[PDB]
Design a protein around this ligand. Structure first.
Ligand SMILES: O=C1Cc2cc(OC(F)(F)F)ccc2N1
Ligand SMILES: [Mg+2]
Ligand SMILES: [Zn+2]
Length: 164
């Protein structure tokens, strides 16, 4: 079923210290998938996983990390080169969004706000007919065994904030 979006994003892996990995994400009408990227040949490398779109309960932005490492900091502008600074789009991923399903949240970092907006808008569209949409979500990341927003310690805890 047609490719809706295809992007290189930094994702937080399921667990140990948190691990972030640069992966290609593919949205079709029924599946969200991710791949090791084959940079040299310009293709999808090895498929690493998939979830059914119909298992998604919620998709929203995530309050940014207070102390992000450089890989997730917003570029200052002109600190890399004099003009045409575009390679940041595969080097820096400071705009995070979350896909909630049964297991709890998947954290994905987008290199630009516009790309994050498109992914959220297209994800909301494809999950509109989902049976288990929640009207409550966590605005902050779950880190060190709890959600920063409400200190709850089940990854599948009901959201502490209502959705508009
Ligand atoms: O380590 C990981 C990264 C990841 C992403 C994910 O969502 C998916 F497939 F991309 F839609 C589901 C499971 C996992 N486990
Ligand atoms: Mg660089
Ligand atoms: Zn919360």
């Amino acid at each position: 079923a047609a490719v809706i979006l295809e992007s290189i994003f930094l994702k937080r892996s399921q667990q140990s210290p948190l691990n972030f990995k640069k992966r290609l994400f593919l949205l079709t009408v029924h599946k969200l998938s991710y791949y090791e990227y084959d940079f040299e040949r310009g293709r999808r490398g090895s498929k690493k996983g998939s979830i059914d779109v119909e298992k998604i309960t919620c998709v929203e932005t995530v309050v940014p990390e207070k102390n992000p490492p450089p890989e997730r900091q917003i570029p200052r502008r002109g600190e890399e080169s004099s003009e045409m600074e575009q390679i940041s789009i595969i080097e820096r991923f400071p705009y995070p969004f979350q896909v909630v399903y049964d297991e709890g949240p998947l954290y994905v970092f987008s290199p630009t706000e516009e790309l994050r907006k498109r992914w959220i808008h297209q994800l909301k569209n494809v999950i509109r007919y989902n049976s288990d949409l929640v009207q409550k979500y966590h605005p902050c990341f779950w880190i060190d065994g709890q959600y920063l927003c409400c200190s709850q310690t089940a990854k599948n805890a009901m959201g502490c904030q209502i959705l508009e």
